[PDB]
Design an enzyme around this catalytic site. Structure first.
Site, PDB file in Angstrom:
ATOM      1  N   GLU A  35       0.876  -1.307  -0.025  1.00  0.00           N
ATOM      2  CA  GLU A  35       0.059   0.000  -0.103  1.00  0.00           C
ATOM      3  C   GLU A  35       0.861   1.348  -0.064  1.00  0.00           C
ATOM      4  O   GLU A  35       0.610   2.130  -0.965  1.00  0.00           O
ATOM      5  CB  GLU A  35      -0.907  -0.034   1.221  1.00  0.00           C
ATOM      6  CG  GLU A  35      -2.192  -1.088   1.210  1.00  0.00           C
ATOM      7  CD  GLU A  35      -3.038  -0.879  -0.255  1.00  0.00           C
ATOM      8  OE1 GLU A  35      -3.123   0.606  -0.588  1.00  0.00           O
ATOM      9  OE2 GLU A  35      -4.022  -1.499  -0.547  1.00  0.00           O
ATOM     10  N   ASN A  46      -7.175  10.388  -5.785  1.00  0.00           N
ATOM     11  CA  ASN A  46      -7.872   9.397  -6.811  1.00  0.00           C
ATOM     12  C   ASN A  46      -8.933  10.704  -7.608  1.00  0.00           C
ATOM     13  O   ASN A  46     -10.043  10.990  -7.303  1.00  0.00           O
ATOM     14  CB  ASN A  46      -8.843   8.470  -6.340  1.00  0.00           C
ATOM     15  CG  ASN A  46      -7.942   7.423  -5.412  1.00  0.00           C
ATOM     16  OD1 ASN A  46      -7.223   6.890  -5.554  1.00  0.00           O
ATOM     17  ND2 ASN A  46      -8.407   7.666  -4.054  1.00  0.00           N
ATOM     18  N   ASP A  49     -12.734  10.103  -8.633  1.00  0.00           N
ATOM     19  CA  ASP A  49     -13.554  10.056  -7.660  1.00  0.00           C
ATOM     20  C   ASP A  49     -13.544  11.316  -6.620  1.00  0.00           C
ATOM     21  O   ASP A  49     -14.392  11.386  -5.530  1.00  0.00           O
ATOM     22  CB  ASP A  49     -14.023   8.911  -7.159  1.00  0.00           C
ATOM     23  CG  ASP A  49     -13.109   8.385  -6.103  1.00  0.00           C
ATOM     24  OD1 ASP A  49     -12.057   8.556  -5.931  1.00  0.00           O
ATOM     25  OD2 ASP A  49     -13.674   7.449  -5.419  1.00  0.00           O
ATOM     26  N   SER A  51     -11.191  11.516  -3.939  1.00  0.00           N
ATOM     27  CA  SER A  51     -11.007  10.961  -2.608  1.00  0.00           C
ATOM     28  C   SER A  51      -9.380  10.792  -2.760  1.00  0.00           C
ATOM     29  O   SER A  51      -8.568  10.575  -3.566  1.00  0.00           O
ATOM     30  CB  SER A  51     -11.654   9.789  -2.454  1.00  0.00           C
ATOM     31  OG  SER A  51     -10.937   8.692  -3.115  1.00  0.00           O
ATOM     32  N   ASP A  53      -6.117   8.546  -0.349  1.00  0.00           N
ATOM     33  CA  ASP A  53      -5.558   7.365   0.458  1.00  0.00           C
ATOM     34  C   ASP A  53      -4.502   7.952   1.433  1.00  0.00           C
ATOM     35  O   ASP A  53      -3.557   8.502   0.843  1.00  0.00           O
ATOM     36  CB  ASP A  53      -5.065   6.185  -0.583  1.00  0.00           C
ATOM     37  CG  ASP A  53      -5.979   5.832  -1.283  1.00  0.00           C
ATOM     38  OD1 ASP A  53      -7.296   5.573  -0.994  1.00  0.00           O
ATOM     39  OD2 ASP A  53      -5.537   5.114  -2.412  1.00  0.00           O
ATOM     40  N   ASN A  60      -8.881   4.995   2.467  1.00  0.00           N
ATOM     41  CA  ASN A  60      -9.949   6.061   1.702  1.00  0.00           C
ATOM     42  C   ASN A  60     -10.488   6.856   2.628  1.00  0.00           C
ATOM     43  O   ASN A  60     -11.484   6.694   3.185  1.00  0.00           O
ATOM     44  CB  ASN A  60     -10.282   5.288   0.728  1.00  0.00           C
ATOM     45  CG  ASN A  60     -10.830   6.069  -0.467  1.00  0.00           C
ATOM     46  OD1 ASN A  60     -12.032   6.613  -0.122  1.00  0.00           O
ATOM     47  ND2 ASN A  60     -10.215   6.077  -1.429  1.00  0.00           N
TER      48      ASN A  60
END
Length: 130
Positions: A35, A46, A49, A51, A53, A60
């Site tokens: 990750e 992202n 969309d 958002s 991480d 998220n």
């Protein structure tokens, strides 16, 4: 901060992660590795969309933490996404625990399925004394 393999494994074990909801320490180690590379500062936007991480587990903002800028998101871990960026991973771990309390478990993170599921993950905790 960027953790060294065995240093992270011991910290996670101390925080109660080994076998949490039946997830072994090596699975968490594999996830953290893929990750963020064991980097608590890691962030990923992202564009598709809107958002982001956050942290060592790249949790998220649309579902788990609040960053105030994500369109129609929620805050399940009831944490500021900023908390997911501290050198101290207690808050992040607590959120990762909340995430796996859902039916999917560790399958919630897609990278785990791709890089960890049904594989030999003993290598992530070898020599660590855990």
């Amino acid at each position: 901060k960027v953790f060294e393999r065995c240093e992270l494994a011991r910290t996670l074990k101390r925080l109660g992660m080994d076998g949490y909801r039946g997830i072994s320490l090596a699975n968490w180690m594999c996830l953290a590795k893929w990750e963020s590379g064991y980097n608590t500062r890691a962030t990923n936007y992202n564009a598709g969309d809107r958002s982001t991480d956050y942290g060592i587990f790249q949790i998220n903002s649309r579902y788990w933490c609040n960053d105030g800028k994500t369109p129609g998101a929620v805050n399940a871990c009831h944490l500021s996404c900023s908390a997911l960026l501290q050198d101290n991973i207690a808050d992040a771990v607590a959120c990762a625990k909340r995430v796996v309390r859902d039916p999917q478990g560790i399958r919630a993170w897609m990278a785990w399925r791709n890089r960890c599921q049904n594989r030999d993950v003993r290598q992530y905790v070898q020599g660590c004394g855990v």
